[PDB]
Design a protein around this ligand. Sequence first.
Ligand code: SF4
Ligand code: SF4
Lengths: 532, 530
Amino acid sequence: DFHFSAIFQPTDPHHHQTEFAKVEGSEKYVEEVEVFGRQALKVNPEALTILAHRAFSDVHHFFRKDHLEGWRRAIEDPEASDNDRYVATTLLKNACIAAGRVLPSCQDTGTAIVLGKRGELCWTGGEDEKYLSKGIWNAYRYHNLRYSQTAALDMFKECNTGDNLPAQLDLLAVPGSDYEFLFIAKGGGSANKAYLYQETKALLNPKSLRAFIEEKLKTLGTAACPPYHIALVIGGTSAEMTMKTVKLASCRYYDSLPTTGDKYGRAFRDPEWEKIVMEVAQKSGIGAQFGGKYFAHQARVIRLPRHGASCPVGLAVSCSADRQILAHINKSGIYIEQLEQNPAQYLPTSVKVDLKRPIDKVRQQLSQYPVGTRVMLNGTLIVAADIAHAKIKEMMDNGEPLPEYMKTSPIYYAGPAKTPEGYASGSFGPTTAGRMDSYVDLFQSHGGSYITLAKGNRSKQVTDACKKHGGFYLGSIGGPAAILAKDSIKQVTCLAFPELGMEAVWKIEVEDFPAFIVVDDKGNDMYSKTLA
Amino acid sequence: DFHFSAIFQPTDPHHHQTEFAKVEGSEKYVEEVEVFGRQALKVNPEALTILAHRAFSDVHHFFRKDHLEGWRRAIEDPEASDNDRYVATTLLKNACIAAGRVLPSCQDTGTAIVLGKRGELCWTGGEDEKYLSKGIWNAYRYHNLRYSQTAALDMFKECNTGDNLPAQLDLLAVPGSDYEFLFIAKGGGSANKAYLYQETKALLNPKSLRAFIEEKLKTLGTAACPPYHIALVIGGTSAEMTMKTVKLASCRYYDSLPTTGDKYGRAFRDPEWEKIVMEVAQKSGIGAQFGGKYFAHQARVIRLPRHGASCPVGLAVSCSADRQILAHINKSGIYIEQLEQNPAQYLSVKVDLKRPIDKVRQQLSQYPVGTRVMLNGTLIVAADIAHAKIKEMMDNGEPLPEYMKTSPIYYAGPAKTPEGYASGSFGPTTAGRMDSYVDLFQSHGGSYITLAKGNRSKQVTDACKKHGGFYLGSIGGPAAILAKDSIKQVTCLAFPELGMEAVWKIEVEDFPAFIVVDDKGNDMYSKTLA
Ligand code: SF4
Ligand code: SF4
């Protein structure tokens, strides 16, 4: 006989385990009515604007307790490495700055994602996408965030949209008369560490699956600012469903699923395999960015049904800029998840490098030290990320020289958020280094980019380039954009390509800017053992 | 100033370009009403059951014109190879048999996927998932389809659900008072050829993008029964959004998008790059399964906005079992897309298996790869779970079973047998998924001859050379004509609890195949899919 079984059967579908705050007076936006014997809720669509505006403000200044507790664990665990403790302390101090509500926790204020669940009898007037987008627009326009969206005018010609739109608006039709939401401000670096694998039944045994996990976790590297919330989804009804599920799992949205399967194919969380993922992450030695135990805060593993011919697998992370917030609109008004507004309660050796010297003397100083050495940088950085590198390569392909401004100072891969009134800099942490790997040998062959500063492990071509050309790659801590702006970045000026907005080439002056020597001029790489 | 711009701005959002038939009497399930001054629609949820049942019945017996036209093009084009024409003719003849409404076009009757768009003022009572699922359950239970869904009792212990549930039910909240749908019966093999790449700005130039397309298309191989509808999505707001978009593009759901971008980041189809994809597909020589020009029916390329730090890319195909139906419910009733009910308007070495296997191997050794053969005799049928169970038995010290040593191994899983028929639809599954077993099984005295579809990895070529084996490629997709004309007896041999994934013993006549891998290190795909 027919038995309907929903794939997802959370025991807490409305997220009662989360603490919510009411938006004061917001009952004025809703009215209970009855039509054809059924209870319905009229919702003024301005409620959607108000809610999205608050969500995409709050999430940039505060974190959940589970995330903060993870950093505290990395500080207090005797098994944490010294670098684990240093990185987690830096990230907690960054969170304390961000809680001042001026500087966002990361310069990459993300793509705005809305998962909405509109009841059959929740009546908004139907212009939900426009009103949510207006709230998002307000959040990014009137706060010190960043416009991160790139429009395609044609296949290759691009421009920044200038407002962090469009958003990803996934509005679902569900039972009832309420409107439920998950808002995510998703960083690009962690979005890029969402991977889909097309596997088979041959994977589905303990030995094969553990070996697969060990291999795939290393491909995350440190490129998305660990400690990570790691999510792994085994199975699914389509690739897109697997990838949606792994995103939501990384946001802890599926924490209340059953922990056993059944003959109807329901989804389940698998605590045994979560523990295995954590053991693999800890034993990998990758650590909280620079070697140790704290590659991961926690793990979520969701097993899904599959077509017999298929086994899609999703792997994804939430990075240090772990930013999501639940909300709902009901007969009592607008409710939004309460994040931790006092992160300070979770709080309990270097070589000084003067960059205000000829770059060849800086190279000479760095050559004295092994990979893993912590340095403190003082002086000028030239800032250039993806679009600037591509434009400069295009100029060189058309016969122009590498610009002189690429030869005078170390190159910092970064893109700043907007500058608060009275501040020298907005949040201004590093970009993922690996995306620039194809340029390093070329630029060094033309006399520049001998020292680069960014975050994440890099490919072998960069290690080889630095050995051939007497170069270095310095790893900033990834994620602490607010404390870097507040304490280290003293002056920012636009140097080239002003038309590119935040993706222009900048000239910045820094003090006490921490980094580790990741790649030296001798063929060595701090990550060569843990990310072999 | 603020300007809202939806990412997707089709000029034909309601699919007016599609022809629909109304389900007779279905106005009884709907009532137009007015609530607080706006137009609304009451829908009896039984309409959802009726609609899903009809959609997931019709789609297994009929195709769209764009798909059928592609097979005709492959036959009529002087530049098509002989193998292109042979494969396209076989697939058209298969479609003619499926249009008899008894045998489905493919044994893999797919995962049931529903994209639904429920208007704000379309009121069903809210139990939409249950009522849609009942209609799907009805379609798979009361017709000669297949139960393809595998439930996980724990991480590794699995069972077939026995009813082709659960479905993928993606129900969206949209403006208005109607209910619009795309139903997809998605085969596993083409589902597996949905790929996500995480790229960078360094890809976004003509030379790099062309080279990327040329490399990634080859990774599709023939493993999802081409000619393909190829979809490519460049950009997206997340990996899952890129992958949803490439799925929908492959279903021609986004055909009416704009063809230029703007400063607000709207999605667009890119005809220039569609033409480039088609040029790459034709020049690859991969062909309609066995070399030629007809790797692809057509291409869809959608360019999306992206976060400056990100460039997700999706690549996906619709296979020979190209199965989707549009539908809508409105104040007049239930409307369902009309597919082509008259596909007919669009129109070797004999190998006796009734011998010791060593004699069959000796005969096959006389011929080069690319030779077309006709098989007559017993095939032993075993796919993914059966292979895993047999490996496990051997790892625990048990023999390779006798039934892996007597006959060619056909990798397949049958659909249900119609009353009065010898066999349900019964075409091949993708060979590559069994590659990890070939050397092992041959080392232990069996699986010397395998029969399936798709190009295989180098380990299989090496195994067949080391052990004196062969891989035979059936045409991929023509499951109904194979069942009607070639399969004479079917018996479950082992592991009956696995449903369609049991081991079967079948007796066949006139079963066509090509020698893809021989016993000498040669592979029919080595030039085109190196
Ligand atoms: S820089 Fe790091 S913390 Fe910020 S969004 Fe990118 S991956 Fe996340
Ligand atoms: S066997 Fe071929 S035609 Fe049938 S669903 Fe699989 S890929 Fe598609």
